[PDB]
Amino acid sequence: DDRLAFYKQLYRDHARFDATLWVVPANMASYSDIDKLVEWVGTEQTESL
Amino acid sequence: LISGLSKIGAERDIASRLHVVLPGSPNRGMFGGDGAYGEAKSALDALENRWSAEKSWAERVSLAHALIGWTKGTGLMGQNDAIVSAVEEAGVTTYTTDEMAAMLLDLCTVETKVAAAGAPVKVDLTGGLGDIKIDMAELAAKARE
């Protein structure tokens, strides 16, 4: 949360209109992460209730 | 990672070019004191060849090569901070993080984006550390020592 709070501080300062920020846990050393991350980055933009 | 976003772009069928800024290390071979940056990032010239070889990668990914010069952080470079003034006495420029960030955005401008679409762009963001005659065997080690 100390890293999480920082990006919130950084966003609430430098954010303009139309601006959307996304923070995620990520490990570039893991091939699984890379595949799973972009599989997340590339799918839908949809929220099913 | 480049291949991954290339698949998504091809599968979901976009002609949009992803601009990948390649964080190249400044001026390989003229510094012996870095020990990490200088050697590792010289194969980025070979990576630009892979894009110049592979034909179908053009529409998905554009390679923007940036050589990131001397840039002062507190944590890693806390030893290097004192001699920043010393290296700058050779008529060379060392950069703050905000300065280098600005140099990286300028590559993200519309003008230089289209330039990357036509052909790989190699940018030297270094402060002239290339023609530097400063001996790293001393002025680096001594700085670190």
Next chain:
Amino acid sequence: LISGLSKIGAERDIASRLHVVLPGSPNRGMFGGDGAYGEAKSALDALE
């Protein structure tokens, strides 16, 4: 392999220089058709 024979030479204490001929690929960058040799052996300049 170079490090290995360097240890033996240092441990058994010889000043003799082992001459390692590095099988570099010819003229990197001016051929696009090899596909293997040209790219791999350019880091031998970094090994020097």
Next chain:
Amino acid sequence: PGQGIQHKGMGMEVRARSKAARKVWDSADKFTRETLGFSVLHVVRDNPTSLIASGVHYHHPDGVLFLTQFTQVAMATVAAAQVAEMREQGAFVEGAIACGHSVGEYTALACVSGVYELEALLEVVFHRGSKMHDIVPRDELGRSNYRLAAIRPSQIDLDDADVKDFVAEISERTGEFLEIVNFNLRGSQYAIAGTVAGLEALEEEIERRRQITGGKRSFILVPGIDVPFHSSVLRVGVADFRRSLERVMPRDKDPELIIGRYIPNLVPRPFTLDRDFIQEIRDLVPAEPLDEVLADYDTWRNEKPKELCRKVVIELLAWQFASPVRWIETQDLLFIEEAAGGLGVERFVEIGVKSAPTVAGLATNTLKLPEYSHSTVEVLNSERDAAVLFATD
């Protein structure tokens, strides 16, 4: 058939088997990938949500395959590939009379008369889709003051003249806009667009007129159509599309394959190049290239006929945007031509795979009510009846 029955992975089974289907799809998919930066194969195979194209951004909460710029392209390619396979097996008869409903008409001409390239077909059709989106005014929410509604005149004693009457009255009365958009089936299917209040007032009328209605019978409102197209409101944007057609539809084409075989929408009666026919077009659709040709028919010299057919064909397709599609007359016309040319056995085949049951079911119910004469007729669908099409059994 027209749009709206399209499904995910439609005719994708045929692509994996037939060679003719692959050539149609791949030549089409390659062009779209290079020029517009997207693939129709992917859209059909798995239905996405949002897509960004060359100059345009398309977003749908459900699917892009159900978006018209895509849907029309998918539908056109699905049918064009299926006919090509039917042609490879030679099952296509030399005297076949062909027609299409809305967007299906472009595929009709493509398959039978080869009036354009596979890539040429998907150009017009794609642009025609993109043209259909920007035509009508919207709100901040993308709302429309208009809509479409499907009428069934049956279940009560009411006629086509009775429907036309009641609609014409409430159109003049309220001062609102109410238009019969589609004449589909004789006593069965009719489509109506105009002001939503007009659609509501018309719904209300038949509920009052029909003595048995507790459930608002005979009236189905159309979801998703916000444009009162095929009415008097759309005639503006033709000239730009009329030029677009002439660009993608050149002058080297087969006159005979179209003539007598092809039934336009704007023109319910079969294509033939004659002073009589060209006049019927002008009457329904006043036009500059047409009115001159009618003025002097003394241009009789033999260089003209193909050049005449080439413009008449384009005029019908360009103004098909405006004029109501007449499916009733299209069906009835087939009866008129047969009866005068002999009534012997006919086979009615619908192509485009999963779109095939629709206009066949439209024909089936039509074969019942006016056609009660006890005729031997075969209704066949590409989706359902394929064993009968290829005769394998």
